[PDB]
Design a protein around this ligand. Structure first.
Ligand SMILES: Cc1ncc(COP(=O)(O)O)c(CN[C@@H](CS)C(=O)O)c1O
Lengths: 419, 419
């Protein structure tokens, strides 16, 4: 008891991640659970890391500026200044962090004090709730729910109850966390939903935290819209991005938070006495990535532009083979995850020997063991009392080699064909 | 007022690093301030990061294991198992972190709760105090004090009051943090000194956090001795290392904590909801760097063995010109920093145009701007009540090319002028 966790980690769980990493190592299924590319990222980013390691400058591999590598943050402000259509100060309005993860951490620790209520949308990215709780905050959850059922559906169909949302704000609301494009639904919030959240933030003096890591992977004909761009919102928005999702190099763990300096000062105090600085040769390589892209921004071969169409064909392909097998897929407006409703297969599969509390866990582990195809359970992304809303579903990642996609389609075809 | 620093970050100011790194960026001095080499680190490690970037393995640049890169944790287990003369589980008893900075953070946040007292030896590495306060703990300081006044002196002369150490230990004491080799002094703790701490931790059931980043930098004839290897000490010690210091790649920001699984589980939990995981290619490169050195642990060519000999000459050179000039240098037993009392020279400097409240701050600023040589003020390593003890000193880094140690002697020699 003496050396037990401090109180502020009451509800403290292992991530669903570990146990599925262990299951995939044991049975070696066709793995649709990892939210990263089967195959290699754009070379030029990669080449830049090799160049920074090989650099003739002795300081390329020594400590860099704590709030962001200079060359890094100059490029960030260039890219974002054009997209948010104001000039972002690279030195005071941009903070570089150990992924979008540590950006989320600096923000939540910097702006959530004991008892502040933070509004979270379900299904949530996994870190959201434990970070709120560790900061002494109180989570307030509200789920996105399909406004239809059967085949045949879009991530725009998953919506909040507007009245519910409204009643969740009061003079105790410190913060709201919105994630768009949404993990794992793929829902890209349209102007009116953003407008809804914006109008509630202004009323209630709430800080909006905008997790825009999949900013660049919105599918035609949908469009990504930043909430820090809406009226009066700049002053009350921290927007978060990630190099790992921007350049498909998730093992690089560099991200950023941008916003007014008044909001960012809070992150800085947390950051300097948490990690202090980030890796120089990686930030250097990302700065050269951004510089390569900044030269050809309007151009189709810009990775920010190209990546949508690269994914879309796999998006469409997966939605097809999952519908073929008897699921109803939610077609994502953006990103690379797909949520599919498998419940009409529940009479065709034997979950008897599966011991998890939740049926999506049973189903997704049975599928690994029985036919060698791994997905992830969406109920791991809900607050205990709402877990029932994710049990009919499964999460698959389609950022995969065309041949591995085709193998998943026939593992499923041949499972159905007999049964 | 809504968006003020939360209570636990109340009275938070920018660190000396955010301030002096920005100072160094401004006036372009000879930088003997923050610790890093101004010349290349081992070529085998730099080559290993280039290879990891260029790897045909498409997992090389994607997420790795959250508690540490499998290949890395194994190498760290192989080495420290030899060094602690026991079998360290790479899986449960090692955590890779973002520098020793996060290893200290995940330790403090994982083991300090509201009202828990922590013993911090002055002058302390400046992160320790604000981290205990962010975790809700009460720091209790004790100064090390030189026992002779000429000269020149050794860092072994800087000693603790044994009665006044004992006094600090009570039922509320959760944690004591020792740093050996010591920053800023270079003090390596002998067996009596570590036994003195060890016995008191065993008597009051306290947790010893051993920050040993400079473990490979002990000069002859002194020796690095690990506190966890003392009797009954393993079950109550977390030992921290850093690849920035082991390999002289400070811009890599990779460190570790090893200790019993019971005490490490707390850390894993903090790491998990902070950054989640660390850079894959960097950890891969550090793993190969250990695999190289493991093959030759007793070779003069081994960097763990070569680096002392390399720094000792630089340390003797620096101690020589600092003394020569009028300063009273403390000659360090390990590491690459040197404290010198510069107060014999306050008639020979003009601090009247510096804004800082502490004299060593004014001193080190004036030197940077006026003569082009940067050091670091030691009062930044003292608790407020005892900052008067660091005012007369200056900390330099002798981890440089001879030509820049000469450039620095030449700056002091001419600045010594005739007045
Ligand atoms: C005693 C001690 N403990 C932990 C660290 C941090 O290591 P990282 O791996 O870089 O995070 C350092 C790094 N020293 C720099 C501060 S940035 C200096 O004082 O010159 C240290 O001296």
């Amino acid at each position: 008891n003496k050396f037990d966790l401090p109180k502020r980690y009451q509800g403290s769980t292992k991530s669903v991640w570990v146990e599925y990493i262990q299951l995939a190592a044991q049975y070696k299924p066709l793995n649709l659970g990892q939210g990263f590319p089967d195959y290699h990222a754009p070379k030029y980013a990669l080449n830049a890391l090799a160049a920074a390691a090989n650099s003739p400058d002795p300081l390329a591999n020594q400590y860099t500026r704590g709030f962001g590598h200079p060359r890094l943050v100059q490029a960030l402000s260039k890219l974002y200044s054009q997209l948010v259509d104001r000039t972002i100060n690279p030195m005071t309005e941009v903070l570089v962090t150990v992924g979008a993860y540590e950006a989320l951490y600096a923000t939540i620790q910097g702006h959530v004090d004991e008892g502040d209520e933070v509004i979270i949308i379900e299904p949530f990215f996994d870190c959201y709730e434990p970070m709120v709780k560790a900061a002494g905050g109180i989570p307030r959850f509200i789920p996105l729910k399909p406004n239809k059922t059967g085949g045949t559906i879009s991530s725009a169909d998953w919506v909040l109850d507007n009245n519910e949302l409204e009643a969740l704000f009061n003079e105790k609301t410190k913060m709201i966390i919105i994630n768009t494009p949404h993990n794992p639904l793929g829902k890209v919030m349209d102007r009116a939903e953003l407008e809804v959240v914006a109008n509630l933030c202004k009323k209630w003096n709430v800080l909006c935290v905008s997790d825009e890591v999949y900013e660049h992977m919105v599918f035609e004909p949908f469009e990504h819209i930043r909430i820090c761009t809406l009226p009066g919102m700049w002053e009350r928005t921290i927007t978060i991005g990630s190099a790992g999702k921007t350049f498909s190099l998730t093992g690089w763990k560099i991200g950023w938070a941008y916003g007014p300096e008044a909001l960012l000062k809070n992150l800085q105090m947390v950051h300097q006495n948490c990690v202090y600085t980030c890796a120089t040769p990686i930030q250097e390589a990302i700065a050269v990535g951004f510089e390569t892209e900044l030269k050809r921004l309007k151009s189709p071969e810009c990775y920010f532009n190209s990546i949508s169409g690269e994914l879309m064909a796999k998006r469409d392909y997966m939605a097809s083979f999952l519908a073929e097998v008897g699921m109803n897929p939610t077609v994502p407006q953006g990103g690379y995850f797909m949520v599919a409703d498998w419940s009409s297969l529940d009479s065709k599969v034997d979950l008897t020997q599966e011991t998890d509390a939740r049926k999506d866990y049973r189903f997704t582990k049975w599928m690994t063991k029985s036919v060698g195809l791994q997905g992830i359970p969406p109920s791991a992304f809900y607050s205990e009392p709402n877990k029932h809303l994710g049990e009919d579903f499964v999460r698959y990642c389609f950022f995969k080699k065309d041949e591995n996609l085709q193998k998943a389609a026939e593992i499923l075809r041949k499972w159905k064909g007999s049964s």
